[PDB]
Design a protein around this nucleic acid. Structure first.
Ligand SMILES: [Zn+2]
Length: 271
DNA sequence: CTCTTTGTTTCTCG
DNA sequence: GCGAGAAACAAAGA
């Protein structure tokens, strides 16, 4: 998932599990707890979930008064709230059991991670990750963005995917943003003029906020939290290879850019 | 059978 | 430092 999908999960978890006491924690794949599963089980069993926050694509469970469970869903991670008698599914890895249900984490590719850290370690954790600003008008300063783009010869799509200029774009929304801002994904960032950078800055905020409002993009239907999204119906280029650009009628093309499938309109996004 | 592809991140290599 | 390529892993499609 990307930031809008993680935010959608965050909001659903906030509504449903805040106030829940963790009765037990079980793992069939304990190695995805990078801080140690048995340590996490000992520390968190019996504690109450107080909140759920997000930074970039990271989910943050606030548990007890001093614990923060940092969860990254990577490519395929999925949470669901299930009955206590729910049958195991093949790629379920972890569960937090409450009195009236359980929160199960599944991840086909086993890429997702859990890390248990303390409250005062959260800000240093993300500083060490070098995560850039949240994609909001308040936090995403166009002036610093412009200065960083001016200094670099990196290509704009890979640079945006780094999470350092701004947090939260992945392959879907970076392709969507670059189409909206009429920028080719291989454009070296020091070639972007001020007006293009301004449009890019605003487009990043606008499409991620739109995606949040619509509950994220569900490319396939799934049975988990954050799976009732509608933003997939608004995608203009991602996965639209061979379909016509909604602005100019040219066929959307797919190329490979720094190892990633990349969808663009060759007319609207001049090389 | 092989090769490629996939919502992410983070590594080695030269 | 940099880019290119690949790995962590599993499944589906060509
Ligand atoms: Zn076009």
């Amino acid at each position: 998932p990307e930031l809008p999908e993680v935010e959608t999960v965050r909001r659903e978890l906030e509504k449903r599990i805040v106030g829940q006491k963790i009765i037990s924690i079980e793992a069939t794949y304990p190695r995805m707890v990078l801080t140690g599963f048995e340590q996490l089980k000992k520390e968190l069993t019996g504690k109450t979930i107080q909140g759920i926050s997000r930074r970039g694509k990271y989910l943050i469970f606030e548990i007890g008064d001093d614990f923060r469970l940092i969860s990254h869903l990577r490519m395929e991670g999925k949470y669901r709230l299930a009955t206590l008698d729910a049958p195991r599914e093949k790629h379920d890895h972890l569960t937090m059991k409450f009195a009236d249900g359980q929160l199960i984490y599944a991840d086909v590719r086993k890429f997702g991670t859990w890390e248990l850290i303390s409250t005062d370690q959260v800000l240093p954790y993300f500083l060490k990750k070098k995560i850039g600003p949240e994609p909001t008008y308040e936090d995403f300063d166009e002036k610093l963005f412009r200065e960083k783009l001016r200094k670099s010869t990196k290509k704009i799509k890979p640079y945006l995917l780094e999470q350092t200029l701004v947090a939260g774009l992945g392959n879907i929304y970076v392709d969507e943003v670059l189409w909206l801002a009429k920028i080719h994904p291989e454009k070296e960032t020091n070639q972007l003029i001020e007006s293009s950078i301004h449009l890019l800055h605003d487009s990043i905020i606008e499409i991620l906020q739109k995606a949040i409002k619509l509950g994220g993009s569900s490319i396939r239907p799934y049975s988990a939290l954050g799976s009732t999204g509608k933003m997939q119906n608004e995608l203009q280029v991602y996965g639209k290879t061979g379909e016509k650009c909604s602005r100019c009628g040219a066929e959307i093309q797919k190329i490979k850019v720094a190892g990633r499938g990349t969808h663009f309109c060759p007319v609207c996004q001049q090389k």
